[PDB]
């Protein structure tokens, strides 16, 4: 482990649409033992925990957000996007002894 976690650079959507963000591991499929976590960064360097442990939604987070594994990757799905969801999203994947963040995905909601 000294792996690289990859995310889609940018993604465009619309209020009412459905968008899916994914997180790749350079060492192979993403297990539930990678504890995939997702956090959102709103303007003003503001961070919010969304999902942790593959699919556990932090208390107080909207129901439009949900995480899961889909293939060799971890996925965060916003069902019925909304304007205020425009932000940069990050995934963290737990390896053997350390956490490793992804590059982040810029989500634009037009």
């Amino acid at each position: 482990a000294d792996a690289v976690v990859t995310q889609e650079s940018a993604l465009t959507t619309s209020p009412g649409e459905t968008v899916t963000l994914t997180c790749r591991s350079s060492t192979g499929a993403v297990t539930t033992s990678n504890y995939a976590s997702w956090v959102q960064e709103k303007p003003d360097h503001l961070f919010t925990g969304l999902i942790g442990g593959t699919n556990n939604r932090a208390p107080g987070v909207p129901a439009r957000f949900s995480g899961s594994l889909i293939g060799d990757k971890a996925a965060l799905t916003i069902t019925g996007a909304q304007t205020e969801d425009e932000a940069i999203y990050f995934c963290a994947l737990w390896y053997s002894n350390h956490w490793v963040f992804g590059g982040g995905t810029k989500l634009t909601v037009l």
Partner: protein, 112 residues
């Protein structure tokens, strides 16, 4: 209802120490671990280290020789301590966790 708040020096010199403090409320450091993460301009969000409910800690390997995470459960504070600081160390430091569930404002740090 659960806050995290960093408290650092903002400014420091090229070979000096670094001591950031996290005051946490809404929970007990005995049950949840706390993480330290920094993000410098031109993105790059990197995990620094962690200290679980049990005083056990984990650090970033390519930083190992410089940091340390401590804490006082009765006072609800996790401390962070780096040294041999240089330019690269300028960034925004955050103490987060519930497994990344909650974050704190952060503290800027410019070295020199």
């Amino acid at each position: 209802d659960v806050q995290l708040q960093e408290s650092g020096p903002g400014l420091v010199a090229p070979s000096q120490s670094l001591s950031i403090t996290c005051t946490v409320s809404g929970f007990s450091l005995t049950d949840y671990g706390v993480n330290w993460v920094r993000q410098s301009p031109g993105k790059g969000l990197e995990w620094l280290g962690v200290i679980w409910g049990d005083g056990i800690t984990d650090y970033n390997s390519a930083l190992k020789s410089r940091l340390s995470v401590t804490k006082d459960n009765s006072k609800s504070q996790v401390f962070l301590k780096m040294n041999s600081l240089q330019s690269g160390d300028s960034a925004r430091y955050y103490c987060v966790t519930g497994l990344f569930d909650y974050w704190g404002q952060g503290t800027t740090l410019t070295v020199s």
